[PDB]
From a paper:
The α-D-phosphohexomutases are ubiquitous enzymes found in all kingdoms of life. Among other reactions, these enzymes catalyze the reversible conversion of 1-phospho to 6-phosphohexoses, with various sugars including glucose, mannose, glucosamine, and N-acetylglucosamine. In bacteria, the enzymes phosphoglucomutase (PGM) and phosphomannomutase/phosphoglucomutase (PMM/PGM) are involved in the biosynthesis of exopolysaccharides that contribute to the pathogenicity of infections in higher organisms, including humans, animals, and plants. The reaction mechanism of the α-D-phosphohexomutases is conserved, and entails two phosphoryl transfers [Fig. 1(a)], with the initial transfer occurring from a phosphoserine residue of the enzyme to a monophosphorylated sugar to form a bisphosphorylated intermediate (e.g., glucose 1,6-bisphosphate or G16P).
The structure of apo-XcPGM was determined with both the phosphorylated (EP; active) and unphosphorylated (EdeP; inactive) states of the catalytic serine. To obtain phospho-enzyme crystals, the purified protein was phosphorylated with G16P prior to crystallization and crystals grown at 4 °C to limit spontaneous hydrolysis of the phosphoserine. Overall, the structures of EP and EdeP are very similar, with a Cα root-mean-square deviation (RMSD) between polypeptide backbones of 0.26 Å. A small shift in the backbone between these two structures is evident in loop (i) and several other regions near the site of phosphorylation [Fig. 3(a)]. In EP, one of the phosphate oxygens takes the place of the serine hydroxyl and coordinates the metal along with the aspartates in loop (ii). A structural shift of loop (i) between EP and EdeP has not been observed in other enzymes in the superfamily, although only a few have been crystallized in both states. In PC1, a distinct separation is seen between the two apo structures (triangles) and the ligand complexes (circles). This variation is the most significant in the data set, consistent with the obvious conformational change of loop (iv) upon ligand binding.
Residue numbers in the entry: 1 to 448
Amino acid sequence: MTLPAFKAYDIRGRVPDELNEDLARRIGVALAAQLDQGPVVLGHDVRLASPALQEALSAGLRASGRDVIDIGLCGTEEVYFQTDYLKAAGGVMVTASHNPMDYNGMKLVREQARPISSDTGLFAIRDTVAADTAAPGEPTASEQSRTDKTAYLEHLLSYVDRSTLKPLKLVVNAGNGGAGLIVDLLAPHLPFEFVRVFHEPDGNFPNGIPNPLLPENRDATAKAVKDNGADFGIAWDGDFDRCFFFDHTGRFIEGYYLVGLLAQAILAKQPGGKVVHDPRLTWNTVEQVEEAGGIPVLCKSGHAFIKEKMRSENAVYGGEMSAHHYFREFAYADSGMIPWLLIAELVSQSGRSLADLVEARMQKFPCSGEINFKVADAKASVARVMEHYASLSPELDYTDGISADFGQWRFNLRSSNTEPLLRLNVETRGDAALLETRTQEISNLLRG
Ligand SMILES: [Ca+2]
């Protein structure tokens, strides 16, 4: 067959049958063969098995003559940042994301933190690994421990004017992932009053695997915001490349609205810039970008597509509705830290609460959120939807699945390639009733 752990965009599998130290070592050998010259940055998340997987990567890389820069326990964005900042040949983050306790994985980048994906080197690595029966060589290169975060912290702080920040009270919820370490290193340089929830890194996850999208986990941040009168709350996934916002009422802010909000924050600092966004939910972003003087650039969803498009357009910022925010100055990479710093600055400077910054936008472009449908036949299910609506003559766009614009409402319907699974997003022009009736109509068709 093929090694199942090699996915479209990263490596992910059950330990030890899909991913283990031997495979990790072979991946390091294969990665050395795929990169231009230079050292390789390695970091890892809080999962208990992550360090051993990193050590195996390092052994394979060093056997292949690659100097290894061990940045230690970190966030995925720190591997991206250090790979670019240190002008490394590439980098690997060992991270299991929100997969089960017996899973782990790896995210791999080349120069400037450019993604390595299935069609840009990852399956080449897979095929090399799959055929590698060579004896493990011994190291011919060194490993250096580089735990200085100064340049990374200075870079994060460079997105805000610290003299304009107010002493907001912010709930922070690392979910026992790694975000608290960075929050605590930033805190001496900021005026905020932090309320720390599930703050200590703990790969045993006594409070659940970090995933702020699950209602039980969502509610822990909401409750802390409400009980403490916080201005807003921020939660992260375990490797903290995704952040999640809760307004002063405890309400979780759907990620769609953060794209337009962050674009308007960034466009104040880089006037006339291009902003890349995905096709699932669009109308609010296009309007907010244009109103702020930027140029919106439609792009297929998925971090590799977003990053490539930002590069080709010199786009200052790119944002996906699914809590991914990318910054040109950050090597075009995603950060779960930059967004909350920008939002805290916007609340501080504007005098407006996070709730009021988004309220009118959510009313003007209400959306369904992303709704997933396991179906027996994705192609037949999409066909049923498109047949049902054909007589309305929607404007169709095929940038990412099917987008259908009917005038006062639109949807995007995307099909998973890993399993028969359709993802639906609907939005309307200020009409909650139409949003629900159309969402339910499409849902009935997809389940047919
Ligand atoms: Ca993540």
